[PDB]
Amino acid sequence: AMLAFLGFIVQEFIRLPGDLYSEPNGVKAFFQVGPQPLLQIFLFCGFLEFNMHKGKLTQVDMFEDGKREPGNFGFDPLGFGKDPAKRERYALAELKNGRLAMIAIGGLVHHALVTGHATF
Amino acid sequence: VIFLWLSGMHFHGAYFSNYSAWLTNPTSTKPSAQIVWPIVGQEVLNADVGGNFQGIQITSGFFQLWRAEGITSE
């Protein structure tokens, strides 16, 4: 939801060169872009899902052996989180921002549906 | 259960029927008290029962019974 909210705000502002990528409205951009770019995103997200969870992808398969902190993919290239004191605060901030972004992603999508122009 | 069934019959007569139109023309309007939703092409079941109404013709005689009861309004 956070990535998708940022995607809305950037899409209506920046956009890519080309006739396909010329819709400030995210909902209408979902249709104008066509199925080919979207299906590639779907397949890439699937590849990511497979490799990040290392095969065990389902509710019964994941956490079957334990030893898996929920949400812990080990992704930390920039090194933020070495200090354990701020780690808990960062986790809480991520959770709160994620919830707020779920609410906001619903809000933006439904604004685009009831008005049709953009978010602004 | 029987009372619920009777309540359903009376509710259909009140809301999804041409009872008022049938009262003014009993001999030329066919009693109908069930309209069919327009899905999968099933709306053809809504027949020309008369009285500016579309629905399934009713053969349970509720319209005649209600008229015999003196019921003149939905």
């Binding site: - | 053809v44 079941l45 027949a47």
Partner: protein, 75 residues
């Protein structure tokens, strides 16, 4: 089943119908019960086959549900 068949055919053939303004009575089937309900072939043809015409020709009309239920009840 025999009772309701007797009722349906007898009423349609010898009670129900229309009355002309001069008083002439014309029935739904035309009085065929008296002479054709006395044989099993008569029941098969002049009642079952004859009055089943409306059920089999109901497709595309508002009575098509009756044809569908006819087939489903056979099934």
């Amino acid at each position: 089943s025999i009772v309701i068949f007797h009722f349906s055919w007898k009423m349609q053939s010898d009670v129900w119908g229309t009355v002309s303004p001069t008083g002439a009575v014309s029935h739904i089937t035309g009085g065929n019960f008296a002479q054709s309900s006395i044989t099993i072939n008569g029941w098969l043809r002049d009642f079952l086959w004859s009055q089943a015409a409306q059920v089999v020709q109901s497709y595309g009309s508002s009575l098509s549900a009756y044809g569908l239920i006819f087939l489903g009840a056979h099934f």
